[PDB]
Amino acid sequence: SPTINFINFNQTGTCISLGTSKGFKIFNCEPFGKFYSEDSGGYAIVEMLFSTSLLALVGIGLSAARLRIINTKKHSIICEVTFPTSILSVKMNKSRLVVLLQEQIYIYDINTMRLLHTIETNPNPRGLMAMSPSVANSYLVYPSPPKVIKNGDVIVFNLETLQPTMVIEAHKGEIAAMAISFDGTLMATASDKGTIIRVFDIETGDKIYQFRRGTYATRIYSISFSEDSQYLAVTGSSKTVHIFKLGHSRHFASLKLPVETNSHVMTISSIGSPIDIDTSEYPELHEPVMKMVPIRVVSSDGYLYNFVMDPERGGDCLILSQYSILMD
Amino acid sequence: SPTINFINFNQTGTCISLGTSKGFKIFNCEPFGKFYSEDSGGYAIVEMLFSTSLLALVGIGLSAARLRIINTKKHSIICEVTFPTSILSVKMNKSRLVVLLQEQIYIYDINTMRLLHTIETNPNPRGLMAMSPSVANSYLVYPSPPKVIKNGDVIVFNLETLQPTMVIEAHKGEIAAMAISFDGTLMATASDKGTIIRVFDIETGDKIYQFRRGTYATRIYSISFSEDSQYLAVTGSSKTVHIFKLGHSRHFASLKLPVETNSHVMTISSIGSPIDIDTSEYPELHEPVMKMVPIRVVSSDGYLYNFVMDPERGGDCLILSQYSILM
Amino acid sequence: SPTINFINFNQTGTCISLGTSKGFKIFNCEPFGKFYSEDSGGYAIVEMLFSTSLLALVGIGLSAARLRIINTKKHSIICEVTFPTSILSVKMNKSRLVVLLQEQIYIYDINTMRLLHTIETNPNPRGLMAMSPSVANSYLVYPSPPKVIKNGDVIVFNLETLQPTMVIEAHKGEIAAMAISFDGTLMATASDKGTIIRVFDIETGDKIYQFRRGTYATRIYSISFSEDSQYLAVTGSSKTVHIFKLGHSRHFASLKLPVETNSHVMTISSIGSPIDIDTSEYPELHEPVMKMVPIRVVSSDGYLYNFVMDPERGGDCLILSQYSILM
Amino acid sequence: SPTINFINFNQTGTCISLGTSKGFKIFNCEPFGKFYSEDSGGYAIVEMLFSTSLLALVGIGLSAARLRIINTKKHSIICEVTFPTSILSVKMNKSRLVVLLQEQIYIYDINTMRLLHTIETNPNPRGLMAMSPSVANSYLVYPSPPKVIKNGDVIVFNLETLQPTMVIEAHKGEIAAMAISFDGTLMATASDKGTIIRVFDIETGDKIYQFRRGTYATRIYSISFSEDSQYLAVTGSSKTVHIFKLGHSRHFASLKLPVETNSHVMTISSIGSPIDIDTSEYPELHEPVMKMVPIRVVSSDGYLYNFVMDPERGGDCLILSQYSILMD
Amino acid sequence: SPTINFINFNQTGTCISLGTSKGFKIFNCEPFGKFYSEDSGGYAIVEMLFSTSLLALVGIGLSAARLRIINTKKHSIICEVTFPTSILSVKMNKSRLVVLLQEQIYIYDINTMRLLHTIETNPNPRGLMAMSPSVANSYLVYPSPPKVIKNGDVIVFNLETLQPTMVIEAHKGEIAAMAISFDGTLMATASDKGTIIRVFDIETGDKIYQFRRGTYATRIYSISFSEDSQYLAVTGSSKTVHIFKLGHSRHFASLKLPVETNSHVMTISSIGSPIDIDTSEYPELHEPVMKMVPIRVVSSDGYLYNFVMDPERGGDCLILSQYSILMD
Amino acid sequence: SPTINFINFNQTGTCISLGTSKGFKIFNCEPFGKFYSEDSGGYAIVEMLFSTSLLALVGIGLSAARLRIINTKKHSIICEVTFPTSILSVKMNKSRLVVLLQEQIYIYDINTMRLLHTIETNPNPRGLMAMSPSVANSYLVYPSPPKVIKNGDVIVFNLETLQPTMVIEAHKGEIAAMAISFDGTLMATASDKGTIIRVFDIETGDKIYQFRRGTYATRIYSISFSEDSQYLAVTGSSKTVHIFKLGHSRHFASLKLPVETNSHVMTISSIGSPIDIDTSEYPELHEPVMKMVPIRVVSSDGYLYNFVMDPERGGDCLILSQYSILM
């Protein structure tokens, strides 16, 4: 079993991207299957648009500096761009392409592929970003630490006009994770303590929600919004996933992975639109069918976990199935 | 009489820097005199610190891109730095040195002279900034127009920590002039129409005062605060200089230059601390001495004009004397 | 005594430019003196125009690629230009500026300083050119070897119209030195063996004179014409300088340096206009005064040697005096 | 009927290339037929080697900047090279490939396809070139106008050693057309007046022949040598084609197109080796067969015209047939 | 090493055709080399004309019923013709193309490719044929067994006029092999016993020569004439090749394959025009050079064997070299 | 009186088959009578076996392509078979059934009626064959002209083994009529000019006899042998029937029809075994009885003519009686 270095959902959560030390893979979620694969070499960043057969490939070191965009349906190379330093993150929408280095931000137009704007930012060794995926509210946010309490400063940058809009005084400590909703309305961040989750409304700048996560300080791996902006997902080193309800404190519902899973695994999750499931097959503990929110949690060990959450009851979520990436 | 391309006061307003097409000169204000001069070449930017024998010299194009730092007392060269494009503005405090190109901002430590930060901004063909001269509140502000209504966006940048603090939605149109008080507390901005003057409190961001300037729209050359932040001075193409009182609308007092003066003159001004003047010599229209704020207005034609303002009466200001720079 | 890396006369031969590992110096010839000097850094190319306080300064590697134009009277910088590779030669007239890299030629207008033309040539590791200093016949010639017998092909390029005029099949072997007279009428070339010196008439292209140099093949350092195109001076590794008379084969007159001189010295020379010298002081072997052509030969060890040639007698030339540059 | 933008014979004159706004076509001459076609898009330059299934494709704007080499028999792409500006001409021999922009010349080796030499020339908005098609005498000539009487300067460049050989003082006015014989021995040029045709011997530089063309000044569209260097063909805006005999003034023989043809049409021609025709079928006005020089003249309207010339009589040439390109 | 299903010389013996289960190959004989190849699939019949880049391809099952004619130089398909049953043999000359099924004969004109004549013959499971390759004497002969001693009846069919010419009472038993000389003058046949070889003159019908082959009855694989009609070659299951002289019984000269070769291999041979060889290199056991008849024997295992025969001495033939088909 | 399209004897010559445009009829020869008749439709081919109540019926176009086998005694249908084109000839023996189209020959087993063989021949628009009626020597012969001098090539085909035996180069011109004796021993052929009659021995292939017919070339309608192969009968457009004696040139005996007969009549004949006739009734010009070979000649106009030939005298033959078929 080859080691994997990167997992990432698309901007809608209906697909899967992945990068191994021997190649990369592209899966699908509802009619599960291996859509694409290529065993060329180690890949560290595999980012794709809303399907559309568009990919962004960063080699593990094709070095980590070079970024290559490949159209999988045409099997051709759109362009290749090099960078002075290793790439730390690449994110995309159907309007702009952004490449982030440790102290610089590069912004490209996805169509023309010509360089547009460059931001000189204070060092970000963690490669933290968040991009609104919609063109109507195209906003990019990056942290602004002081150069050596005013450490958790985040710069709200509008990609449409290529000018900053405001400065958000997010937290006292360094930012550890950040995400933007699908429509670009909201924003969520968390310090390196992972104890307090804060939600700011990007257009006005007001803090809307403040959630407490866990009891003691522990690392946060990633944050992701629901597609309908109803729920927010956080994953940490405690091998537990929390879901906070944004329909408005304590986490609304929690996901516990199977015990056999090792605790030293990074997990990214995604929340999908509610679906109907047959209660006859699953003794939830009854109407024949009731709406269940499906949750997909994939870990760096190469597994996929499917949960269902009751929007009213919440609580601990039942687990339906456990596929295995890199195999059937 | 050689043509002059650049005039500015020092950060305290007690000195004069000037650049001709043949060299640069340095003057003084109260015991007027010519401290230094060199007939080296064309100079476009001659900026000085709080005396201290430190200068920034930019050639007319010594190219326009090159910047040279010279100690006038030692007649030596501290350093020499080049830039890919022509320099548009240079400002200093006793802690940081800022060089602005049309699209880039370079910040240097005044002591070590090593580069500290670089800012990629939207193009500024007008070379507009404002630098707080005090190290306690060292702030830099530069405009951020959208790249091709929200055209008059300005970025409040902190030099101490090298991180921006906030974004101020100053005006609807493009910014034309910026000025920061001596202590770095306030910032004043002017749109390209020069009809509304707005001053913001830099730490909070709230607009404190709003001034109406003149009757019709006309260009603004420069803005400058008083040492004690009591008054604000603006000069425009109407050949008239206005003084706005910040002790708290309409201009408090107006400076009318002599009629024979050319109308197409760049005019910069400065406000000094109140001093005692004898009313026996000057029929102000009476106690023997009364405090009157002295104002120095140097124009691009090469003349200095001294005025006095009565802080209570205000109104049209009397002119005492006129020298002639370059002579 | 710092090492020196570059010596050349001006386009009239009445001045000296020189570059050390610590700075550059500028001298004069008839009333000998040191006009200028700076201990800035290593300089590899120091080229001057017809006095006029204009210089081209190239750092030893200020990198070798960078070229800086400095006005010594104003102590300012006209401009600063970089190149992808190290500069190999720089020459000027009062109309054009030429910068040569190993495979590229850049031509600049001396006044506006904007780029005018670029020539892609076959590699020239020796950095060889020749520039006519008069604007009436402004010509540039550079060698064009085949890219890997016809190896000594040289391209006659007109700077005025920026179009080549003709191709001269100069020599069978690679070109080693090129020189153009003051008026731009003639061009002289030297093969890598230094045995045959050929001069061509640039407008017609016909070889006018052919000179045999020395007895055996040896390297040639530089060639230079007289102001009136009467004589041609070549210097080689044999520590001997030859003068060929163009008033029309064998060298007309030979310059033998003092024996104590090191043999491994780069030697450049120049020929000046005839002057009156007193035979009473100098027993030439007699009228009190007779015109004798003065020759100045500066070597890489740092010394200047003054000779005189009798235009009718020719022959071995007497040496009058010796100074010491850098002292 | 789609509009066509480019017509060009091969280096031997036994084939035809063509480019439309919808695709390109490749014909043949003696056993006439449509050898190849591809309706991809607009093409502006279609240049091919001596058969050998080698092509050079320049899109109308595959932009005009990009040049693509396609092997029609293998249906694959050998390589793709981009250029900063739009391409104005591409010519080839079995040794070198040259791409010309408005102020630059690029020279490539046809086999290795690596860049060899670059010439910085004065602006040529007309895209004028001439290449000897034989490797024994590989010479390339381009005009050298002054940069703003010495306007008609042409630089004779040897492609083998990549060094200029001489400078030719061709004409007083700007050069309008130029061509090189098959063996690379001769050269022919004409100013923008089109009144005087001059022939220079490329190896020595001497002007060998000087022909007068027409009476009043009129534009010249193209010049082409005969394969055996016996005759030279010029075509102008007068809807008339002249042939000058090089076996050595006034044009030896002239070709008049049918009256129905519009005068605002560009025509390129080619001269083939002499062939035997039966005088019984054609009342020339008699031996049964006598040698006739065949001439093929194709116009931008999409037609082909076949003429026969008597090398001794010359004069106005009889027209045998009139095919139609884009159809049968 | 892929298995091969078909080997056949051309009508002159100067080339080689071959068909594998993965593709087909085309070799050459005197300047030995691999002229062509194509790894598409299994091929059972690969027949080619006198060079001329013409091929006949029958798939192993492109089924065995379908026959496809491909021009290897043009890489195109001339035509495709289907048949109700599997093809058993295809032979060609520069005038006619004949396709044989188990009970039917189809004759086509090679140029026009339209059907001309069809012969309804009694069943021939062995696919036996013989065609004169010259247009002057275009004769086709096929066996005519009785439908269930008069079993070895062969019908002499003239392809030019498409009418039978005579009936030959060849042998008492079933015919096993048959061949026609290059000029179409002679004919040779052999029964399934392989003991007696009979030669009939096709124009008159008289039996000219009768040769005894071997001692006991054994199978005969193929018969081939010399180009000059001087010698006749037979190959059997005894791993031995006999040559009978037609300059006029017992075989004149015999060819013994190397012992390492397996006996269960089918061998086809061909006789070429006499050539000069240097006796200095080869100690034949002496003039420096003497004429030797070269013989090429290829077996179904994938090897080629070159022999030399002395026309006067005959006897056992020396073997010069042993190439290897499917490799160098 | 309906038109008649087809007349032929049986394989023994003791019966008559006939086809009208309204139906078919079957007669007898020695005790003359009408055995059978049906007014069904137009019939073009009515062929019978050796009595045995077996018939082959082809419609006039029951299309011309269709063939129907009918048993007249049972009034039933044995089978029905169609063909892609119109049938041109049908013949039988007691072992095989042959159907000929213009370019194809079909052979059927008379008993099982399953198809046995098919022959692809060059086109025969005249529908010519010859069938041996004995199973001991069952042979079929059909012409093989070249497909567009050797035009009269005929193929000897053996029905028993279904394989051809030999090819006979019969005549230079196209074959016009073929006939095989009762035992299948001999075959007779006639060219389109009808001048030369050739008979070949089918087993050996050698031409045995050659007969000259008439004086000038004229068409031949049919040929038929005697039962004992003693005589051969040919009928042509000259309204004269010739008898050639094969007991071994010029015709042995000639049959002249009555003058009133139409000249444009298809005439077929047959030769029977010798019988005893009374010379008292017939003045032959005498023993009371002498054997005379009876000849029956039925013509397309619908009449039967009875002749007698003296085997020794030969010569012109006397006519005894005339009936009228269809009445």
Numbering used by the authors:
A (entry chain F), D (entry chain D), E (entry chain B): 5 to 65, 70 to 156, 222 to 321, 409 to 445, 458 to 500
B (entry chain E), C (entry chain C), F (entry chain A): 5 to 65, 70 to 156, 222 to 321, 409 to 445, 458 to 499
Task: Please share text taken word for word from the publication where this structure appeared.
Atg18 belongs to the protein family of β-propellers that bind polyphosphoinositides (PROPPIN).
To further investigate the binding mode of Atg18 to lipid membranes, we mixed soluble Atg18 with PI3,5P2-doped large unilamellar vesicles (LUVs). The membrane surfaces are typically coated by disc-shaped particles corresponding to Atg18 β-propellers in dimension. When membranes are aligned in parallel, we found connecting density that we interpreted as Atg18 bridging two juxtaposed bilayers. The inter-membrane distance in the Atg18-WT and Atg18 s-loop samples was constant over parallel membrane stretches and very similar at ~80 Å, respectively, whereas no consistent inter-membrane spacing could be detected between undecorated 100% DOPC liposomes without Atg18. Further 3D subclassification resulted in a structure of two S-shaped densities packed against each other made up of eight disc-shaped densities with ~50 Å diameter each. In the density, we found Atg18 molecules in four pairs of dimers with a slightly twisted interface matching the observed I-interface of the tubular Atg18 assembly determined above. Notably in the cryo-EM density, the basic Atg18 dimer unit was found to assume a 45° tilt angle with respect to both membrane planes, which could be independently confirmed by measurements in raw tomogram slices. The fitted Atg18 dimers lack the interaction through the T-interface due to PIP-binding.
